[PDB]
Design a protein around this nucleic acid. Sequence first.
DNA 1: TGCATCCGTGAGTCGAGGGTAATAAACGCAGCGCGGTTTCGGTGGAAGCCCCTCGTTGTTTCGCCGCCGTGACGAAG
Length: 213
Amino acid sequence: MLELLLLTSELYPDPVLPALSLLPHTVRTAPAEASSLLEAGNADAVLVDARNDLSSGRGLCRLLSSTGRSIPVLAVVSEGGLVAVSADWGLDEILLLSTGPAEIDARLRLVVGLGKVSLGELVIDEGTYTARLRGRPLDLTYKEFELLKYLAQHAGRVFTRAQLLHEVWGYDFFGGTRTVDVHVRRLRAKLGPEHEALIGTVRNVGYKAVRPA
DNA sequence: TGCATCCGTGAGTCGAGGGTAATAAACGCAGCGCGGTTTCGGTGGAAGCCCCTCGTTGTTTCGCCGCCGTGACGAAG
């Protein structure tokens, strides 16, 4: 009753997951391509092969992730390869290549079968990449909107420039930037006289966010 | 005087390269100095006991990282 779409170059679903033939779910196969995500129709779940290669499997799990709406993404890895399997893959469920038929059935029937938190005086709207600080208008540049976003949810957490750099930027990451200094100085300006006490900037500890009061 | 007759010499620079033999013995005593042995000893290595060498604060100050703004070369439509 589920259409499972395999992105695997094995040309058969059998060595990727052996016991799946014991369940009468339909399996539609294609090589591990992003364009075969356009090959998804009424697929209820999707399995990626990452048994020997954790990197492209994790990135494909990432390629699916955050796109929306979304159909939940699954992957199959090895047991010594479960070290890299984490929440950073964008997984909803991970499968091993030795999980049983009723086990895969239960994981599938679990996974295929609200608003933002208010409020730290900085609302986050995901549409135009902008916020709202005690006032409707709040212009945030491409990276001056996520810098506040990064310090928003991790309020109270201490983050160094590089720790911020690789999540706030791509990052590349360049050096000798002061881009944090350029931003936080700018992010402490468009926030008006009030809420200047939203970021904790003590010397050489990085740039932590201080939540009220 | 000869005159034979022994005789005292040397006769290769150098490499290959360790060794082979014999007759009648016992007792006993003395010194003996090497090695069993037999004393305490104070100076040895602990055990317990007191004056002086090494750690707190009180600044100083270059240094440096956050900040602050500038400008442009970039970034996206």
